[PDB]
Design a binder for this molecule. Structure first.
Ligand SMILES: Cc1cc2nc3c(=O)[nH]c(=O)nc-3n(C[C@H](O)[C@H](O)[C@H](O)COP(=O)(O)OP(=O)(O)OC[C@H]3O[C@@H](n4cnc5c(N)ncnc54)[C@H](O)[C@@H]3O)c2cc1C
Ligand SMILES: Cc1cc2nc3c(=O)[nH]c(=O)nc-3n(C[C@H](O)[C@H](O)[C@H](O)COP(=O)(O)OP(=O)(O)OC[C@H]3O[C@@H](n4cnc5c(N)ncnc54)[C@H](O)[C@@H]3O)c2cc1C
Ligand SMILES: Nc1ccccc1C(=O)O
Ligand SMILES: Nc1ccccc1C(=O)O
Lengths: 478, 477
């Protein structure tokens, strides 16, 4: 469907076997091209990397971690969740990669933030934080409406409609006050007979407002984050092993470290080291998916203004750490099944698993941070990272967070070879550097999530691949 | 564990093999009681009923439906979703019954309501509706705050903190106005290069308010509805087949219509018809989980005031209708994976499946409606119910709703077999509810109708546990 069949013989070399490079290869093959993918790593998928039992990684600081998670247990060190709009889902369909729901919103996970209130550092469930925030917000807006404050922008009918909504939205008393709600939850669960349970009591208005316990609620609305969300059963990398299988390992050189990319008379020549040897491959066209800050390191004959453009896609920090617990305390004690706790601490968030519900063990993502709050972990050894994660996590979920730990494994994307970034931020943000890089450089085409309007999304890398393959095809057709 | 081991030889006859009965028998057996369950259906589970290929049901009007859903495809005609706090999840663990997420909130499903606006009968995604509703709500509160309307209840610091939340929560402009948002979604999806996509433009403040487009938002917050929600993989009934297998089919008589229940000198005697044959069983105690409005039909020696209390638990209407499509158009076209569309139409809601994502076919719950809006379907034939469900569904999801239909299957709880109600609606804890919590000598009542979670498995299971506990303490005395 992407493009028609190609007439005659035509070759492409793809640099990088991440999502953009594998998608490119896949589509080019379908159309009848000869394709070769050159991947530096020994796995397919790039920044889509799933940590499981056996995974070993040596980072740019020379520390080697060996993952020992139990069979079936894993976490996604990069890409982990997909919204419904993204072409990633269509590819899961085409490739036969089963998906399942990803818990991107949960009433029972915690918020915990510092403030000049008695709620400072205190863990509060989302449903409680929500009921209080929306209760007092609805009360206040109703107060202003009744007061006449909005008489110049609302009719009398409007005011009565708005009021009705606010009473229900905020679960207000009959006289317009927020006095609590069953929406907060219960200290004792409603049962049978005369066991009515006991609601959790509300916090006071000023402390709710000043605590900032609602600071993350808008996350629920993000176009790429709103429920429903999805993820492949058994890891996000299953998409890229499905791509690898379809392309054929014959057409993918793993452990191929590209060192040179040059426009030549016959197309593009790419030199790479694989198996200790210097190798060369020439093809009619090349699709370069190596992260833009790493492309400059190659030997090349790219024009000055292209090399300057590449530098404007600044690299960024992000990272995760996952802990296998031998007891699913979050489910058994906290009644949390998936979702994420959120905090202002460096850890940023604690993400609970979306598989093996009610089982005996599980991996928790003890932190997923970015920017400044990932810089706080980058330089730390793995052991140090873990200690900092458990310390900060115990401040949110209690002592239980320190118990029943089997193993752990971290990644910091700025510190990981062949990435050296989580994703690009273009200086000046389309920027002129981004625009420039959409243009082919003779027979060299750039592709990847940085050359999309969904940077840090697989959809970005995949729509980039698809656009580039379409361009090459339309050129070949003439 | 619920109760310690009983001493000696003690028997209990459980009437009904739905959740309350099966839980009762499970827990009693575990403590070492002799237990026999009598279930009128062929299946266990009661109002937990999952329709699959081969399912056949003749309702109280004499219409027989035969489900022909493809292998592995189904829908829950009764219980379908579980919140994290319910003991239903604990029993799924105990029983080894795999659970998965249930899609109880979706940004991409539609709301569709009648109003005296141009939005009347028009489908709007939840994310568009929310963005507009919360965008304008935040603008209006921020305006009032800035104008000094709330200076008597908020300090300057409070005002500044509230304003900060409001701009974020409403995605307001730098000058405090709702001007639209990427949160609404995109007419054209943002892609690569210069394919920026095109944001869906906002409705006006008046349109939003006067359409009542946000009337269903508070559903998201219900204690028993808030995400995350769960459901057994492959159907809710799988809980009750798991109970059945633990209890053992030698201790359950299916096809066993109870016709009498009496306190007698030897304990409690229950008469039932099974295979057209009249049978009788006597046990030391009975646990009666038959819906309360049905209890009066039995030959009995219950006190008058107990027969009167049972009549206070008024039956309620609810039903559903599933359609198998040979194409998953909701996923492929509408980018809807699970969740529900909501409406003021009789259909009430259209629920999209939480399994077989990206497959070639699936079952849509074309309606799940209660009260007035189920009465509207109850007396219709299934064919008429289908016709509608399709007409109204096509008004929300377009002409595609009418195409690629394979088969269908409906249930209406009031019209059906050994239920004759979705759940109890007590007249006016009421005195009648309270009265029925007491044994009637050696006869105990259990069910979701004697709980603070009526219309939840949690309510039936906690009722069963309390009854079992009471029987055990009594034997201990
Ligand atoms: C922390 C984090 C979280 C994310 N969250 C999500 C999410 O939830 N959902 C989602 O959809 N997306 C998410 N992503 C984004 C997603 O991972 C990327 O968009 C996608 O991986 C980009 O694909 P790419 O092909 O453009 O680049 P990459 O994945 O970076 O692929 C580039 C490839 O080039 C290779 N390479 C580099 N140098 C050489 C060399 N010298 N020679 C040969 N090969 C080389 C690399 O090994 C790599 O395989 C996340 C990413 C990170 C890191
Ligand atoms: C439309 C609908 C939606 C619901 N949604 C949910 C949901 O999403 N989540 C949730 O947890 N729950 C939900 N439920 C509620 C759940 O199904 C009930 O709470 C539960 O089934 C109650 O169990 P019970 O044992 O009290 O009664 P029942 O399930 O009604 O069981 C009573 C049993 O007695 C039997 N019986 C009747 N008469 C006789 C006879 N004379 N002799 C012998 N046996 C007899 C019946 O066949 C039946 O098996 C829903 C219910 C309905 C109908
Ligand atoms: N894709 C991302 C970009 C930024 C923040 C979070 C994510 C996340 O989905 O993990
Ligand atoms: N348990 C029920 C009670 C009433 C309304 C909805 C449901 C439901 O969960 O579908």
């Amino acid at each position: 469907d992407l493009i028609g069949k190609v007439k005659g013989s035509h070759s492409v070399v793809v640099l990088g076997g991440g999502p953009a490079g594998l998608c490119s290869a896949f589509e080019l093959q379908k159309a009848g091209y000869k394709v070769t993918v050159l991947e530096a790593r020994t796995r397919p998928g790039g920044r889509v990397w799933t940590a499981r039992g056996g995974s070993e990684e040596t980072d740019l600081s020379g520390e080697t971690q060996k993952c020992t998670f139990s069979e079936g247990h894993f976490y996604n060190v990069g890409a982990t969740r997909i919204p419904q709009s993204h072409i990633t889902l269509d590819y899961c369909r085409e490739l036969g990669v089963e998906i399942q729901g990803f818990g991107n919103q949960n009433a029972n996970t915690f918020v915990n933030y510092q403030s000049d209130t008695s709620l400072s550092g205190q863990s509060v469930t989302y449903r409680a934080a929500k009921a209080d925030t929306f209760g007092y917000m609805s009360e206040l807006l109703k107060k202003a409406t009744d007061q006449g404050a909005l008489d110049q922008v609302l009719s009398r009918e409007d005011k009565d409609a708005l009021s009705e909504f606010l009473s229900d939205f905020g679960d207000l008393s009959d006289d317009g006050r927020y006095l609590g709600s069953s929406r907060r939850g219960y200290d004792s669960e409603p049962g049978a007979g005369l066991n009515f349970g006991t609601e959790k009591k509300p916090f006071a208005m000023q402390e709710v407002i000043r605590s900032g316990i609602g600071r993350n609620f808008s996350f629920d609305f993000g176009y790429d984050q709103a429920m429903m969300m999805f993820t492949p059963v058994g890891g996000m990398d299953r998409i890229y092993y499905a791509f690898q299988d379809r392309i054929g390992t014959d057409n993918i050189v793993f452990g191929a470290e590209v060192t040179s990319m040059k426009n030549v008379s016959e197309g593009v020549t790419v030199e790479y080291t694989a198996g200790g040897s210097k190798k060369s491959i020439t093809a009619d066209y090349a699709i370069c998916t190596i992260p833009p800050h790493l492309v400059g390191r190659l030997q090349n004959n790219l024009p000055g203004d292209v090399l300057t453009a590449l530098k404007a896609a600044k690299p960024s920090s992000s990272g995760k750490l996952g802990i296998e617990y031998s007891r699913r305390w979050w489910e058994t004690e906290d009644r949390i099944y998936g979702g994420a706790s959120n905090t202002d601490k460096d850890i940023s968030q604690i993400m609970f698993p979306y598989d093996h519900y009610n089982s005996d063990r599980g991996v928790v993502v003890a932190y997923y941070s970015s920017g400044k709050r990932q810089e706080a972990f980058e330089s730390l050894t793995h052991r140090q990272r873990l200690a900092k994660a458990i310390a900060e996590g115990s401040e949110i979920h209690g002592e239980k967070y320190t118990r029943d730990i089997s193993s752990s494994f971290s990644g910091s994307w700025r510190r990981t070879k062949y990435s050296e970034s989580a994703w690009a931020n273009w200086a000046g943000s389309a920027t002129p550097e981004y625009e420039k890089l959409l243009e082919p450089v003779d027979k060299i085409y750039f592709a990847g999530d940085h050359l999309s309007n969904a940077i840090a999304w697989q959809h970005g890398a995949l729509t980039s691949a698809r656009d580039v393959v379409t361009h090459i095809h339309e050129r070949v057709a003439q």
